[PDB]
Design a protein around this ligand. Structure first.
Ligand SMILES: *[C@@H]1O[C@H](CO)[C@@H](O[C@@H]2O[C@H](CO)[C@@H](O[C@@H]3O[C@H](CO[C@H]4O[C@H](CO)[C@@H](O)[C@H](O)[C@@H]4O)[C@@H](O)[C@H](O[C@H]4O[C@H](CO[C@@H]5O[C@H](CO)[C@@H](O)[C@H](O)[C@@H]5O)[C@@H](O)[C@H](O)[C@@H]4O)[C@@H]3O)[C@H](O)[C@H]2NC(C)=O)[C@H](O)[C@H]1NC(C)=O
Ligand SMILES: CCC[C@H](N[C@@H](C)C(=O)N1[C@H](C(=O)O)C[C@@H]2CCCC[C@@H]21)C(=O)O
Ligand SMILES: *[C@@H]1O[C@H](CO)[C@@H](O)[C@H](O)[C@H]1NC(C)=O
Ligand SMILES: *[C@@H]1O[C@H](CO)[C@@H](O)[C@H](O)[C@H]1NC(C)=O
Ligand SMILES: [Zn+2]
Length: 598
């Protein structure tokens, strides 16, 4: 009978969760060792442990059918059982799973091992993306030099893994169907527990899209004045190599040439960080200080002992792309970041520490609940702090911003600088998964895979490659997350909901009042606010124990994902920019790109 069985089921889950945490610890350790030190030996070890865990998960999923779990009274027990039925890749036959793991490490290691030759020195060929190539992309205003590094990187990080990517799509699809999802798109979207999630994002994106078009138009106008009309046309997509980022996902590196008021201050604290002798250690300690100032959890000793916060100086290959790691015990959490002393890196440190805080907040939960309310929640945490860290208010407090006068023009500069990151990112992030969804769903023929990528980049972001590409190239895997099989929609969700969290935290902190000119949202600093921290504790401690609207409700009483807050933040910019584009007769929109030959 069911009453007795539900009691047995509760005991079953309690033991299984603890077992899963312990088994996952071992897989995570091997994954950490490989990421910190890429070798054929470590790859083999990582993949063999994963195969072992997958086999165990199959048995778990099989064992769930022995319990009448759908018949139970407890919503909590039913939720835990449902989590256990979701095998993902582990649903694949033994041999297929092994092949997928081999395909995945082939792609990630290719990306991590990319090296190009110096533009000026063809004998020096040890330039890696992080930091050598990214430094040129962020700093050079030599458009031909930029185009050279763009092509070299995309050819090596992208085109080189086409065959592996193709097999990955096939096996990803096979896995999704074994879990009875239509494709990997539906498998990813399942994490958001909402059958209208795509439509919701289309609706929010459509509301913010006109502001992006205005920013795009103004930036193109300003780039024409810098590079001339031979490099940048008035009516075409912007050549992406001029935007200060390898993937044109963030344009903040070219703020010095596109800022609304060039004679007024533009916040760039990298030089002052170097002048004050900042180190990666100091940056992480400052991050820790921010969290604890909000009455949140201090970084444990394991973090400091085990984390890698600087790029190793030996000859070894590693994944430098920053990440945060949960080892599923108590207080064993780590970051691996090839940290540099820059303003954007200070934000990246806080982003990564946001993941760590989430790990610590929910580590008391049963294993299946030791993850974000949804993937976007996990990405949002650290960005909420970075928003306040980025304010002139905060940067003055820590002595990184000196002799700053916050007049109307300086405010517009700062709002624009923020938008070059936050608004610009939105169409980018959407296209990363729109692309992969379309491949997963079988909506694009293999003969059209490359130009399908560039078509989306054109349609949504109005950017294009610096040189003509074709189906002989394969450019998508040149973005880390595409080579590394990391879902990207989490970041689109994050960039929307982080403003919901930020607005609410600022109101709680007494730092934002819409009717008070002295408390604007764009200058809110939540440092030292226990009240804002209390909201975070209430939400983060839940992990995935409840559907995400319940986690949002615990933060601020709301249950709906909304673009209201991000629009509210940027409203003063929207008003000024619409007027400025009209003042300057700025062309808005773009013709279809000629840069991908079918
Ligand atoms: C993805 O979707 C798949 C369907 O498209 C699904 O695959 C199905 O899973 C079913 C298991 O839930 C499975 O059903 C069993 O079928 C057995 C016979 O199947 C044969 O013939 C089929 C064609 O006629 C072939 O396709 C098969 O290959 C087989 O040759 C039955 O013998 C079996 O039965 C037993 O189990 C049920 C248990 O059900 C419950 O039992 C409790 C008792 O505790 C009851 O209280 C409760 O009410 C309920 O009845 C018993 O009722 C029964 O007495 C037997 O013990 C069972 O029906 C099905 O075969 C399979 N394939 C297909 C094509 O249907 C995947 O599972 C889905 N994947 C995921 C991850 O969800
Ligand atoms: C395995 C990928 C980890 C990922 N790594 C970071 C560096 C990352 O990829 N990104 C995303 C990116 O770099 O594409 C944007 C996101 C916005 C804040 C700064 C860095 C964040 C993460 O921590 O979410
Ligand atoms: C990297 O891994 C190799 C074996 O794969 C090991 O011998 C070596 O100690 C590791 N290097 C470092 C710097 O940890
Ligand atoms: C700090 O957090 C604890 C719970 O973690 C809470 O009880 C306490 O009230 C908080 N401190 C302040 C000053 O609010
Ligand atoms: Zn993240």
């Amino acid at each position: 009978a069911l009453v007795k069985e539900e009691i047995q089921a509760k005991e079953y889950l309690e033991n299984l969760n603890k077992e899963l945490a312990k088994r996952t610890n071992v897989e995570t350790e091997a994954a950490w060792a490989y990421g910190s030190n890429i070798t054929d030996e470590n790859e083999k070890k990582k993949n063999e442990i994963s195969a072992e865990l997958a086999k165990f998960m199959k048995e778990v999923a099989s064992d769930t059918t022995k319990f009448q779990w759908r018949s139970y009274q407890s919503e909590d027990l039913k939720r835990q059982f449902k989590a256990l039925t979701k095998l993902g890749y582990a649903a694949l036959p033994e041999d297929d799973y092994a092949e997928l793991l081999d395909t995945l490490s082939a792609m990630e290691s290719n990306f991590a091992k990319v090296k190009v030759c110096d533009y000026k020195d063809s004998t020096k060929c040890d330039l890696a993306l992080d930091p050598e190539i990214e430094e040129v992309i962020s700093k050079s205003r030599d458009h031909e030099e930029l185009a050279y590094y763009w092509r070299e990187f995309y050819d090596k990080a992208g085109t080189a893994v086409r065959s592996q990517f193709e097999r990955y799509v096939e096996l990803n699809t096979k896995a999704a169907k074994l879990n009875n999802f239509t494709s990997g798109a539906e498998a990813w979207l399942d994490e958001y527990e909402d059958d209208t999630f795509e439509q919701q994002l289309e609706d929010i994106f459509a509301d913010i899209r006109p502001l992006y078009q205005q920013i795009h138009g103004y930036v193109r106008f300003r780039l024409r004045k810098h590079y001339g009309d031979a490099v940048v046309s008035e009516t075409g997509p912007i050549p992406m190599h001029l935007l200060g980022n390898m993937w044109a996902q963030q344009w903040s590196e070219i703020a010095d040439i596109v800022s609304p008021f060039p004679e007024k201050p533009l916040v760039d604290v990298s030089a002052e960080m170097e002048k004050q002798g900042y180190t990666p250690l100091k940056m992480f300690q400052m991050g820790d200080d921010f969290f604890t100032s909000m009455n949140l959890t201090k970084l444990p000793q394991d973090f400091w002992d085990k984390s890698i916060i600087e790029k190793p100086t030996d000859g070894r290959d590693l994944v430098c792309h920053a990440s945060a790691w949960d080892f599923y015990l108590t207080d064993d959490v780590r970051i691996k970041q090839c940290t540099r002393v820059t303003q954007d890196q200070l934000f990246t440190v806080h982003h990564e520490l946001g993941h760590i805080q989430y790990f610590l907040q929910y580590q008391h939960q049963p294993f299946v609940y030791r993850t974000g309310a949804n993937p976007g929640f996990h990405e949002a945490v650290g960005d909420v702090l970075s928003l306040s860290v980025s304010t002139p208010k905060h940067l003055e407090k820590i002595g990184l911003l000196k002799d700053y006068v916050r007049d109307d023009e300086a405010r517009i500069n700062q709002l624009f600088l923020t938008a070059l990151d936050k608004i610009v990112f939105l169409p980018f992030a959407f296209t990363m998964d729109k692309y992969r969804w379309s491949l997963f769903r079988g909506e694009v023929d293999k003969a059209n895979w490359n130009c399908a990528f560039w078509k989306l980049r054109d349609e949504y972001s109005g950017i294009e490659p610096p040189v003509v590409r074709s189906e002989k190239d394969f450019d998508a895997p040149a973005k880390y997350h595409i080579s590394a099989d990391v879902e990207y929609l989490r970041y689109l969700v994050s960039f929307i909901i982080q403003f919901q969290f930020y607005k609410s935290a600022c109101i709680k902190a007494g730092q934002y009042d819409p009717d008070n000119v002295e408390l604007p949202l764009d200058n809110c600093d939540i440092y030292g606010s226990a009240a804002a921290g209390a909201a975070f504790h209430n939400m983060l401690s839940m992990g995935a124990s409840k559907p995400w609207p319940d986690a949002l409700e615990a933060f601020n009483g709301e249950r709906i994902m909304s673009g209201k807050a991000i629009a509210e933040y940027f409203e003063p910019l929207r008003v000024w920019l619409e007027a400025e584009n009209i003042k300057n007769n700025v062309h808005i929109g773009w013709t279809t790109s000629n840069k991908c030959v079918s």
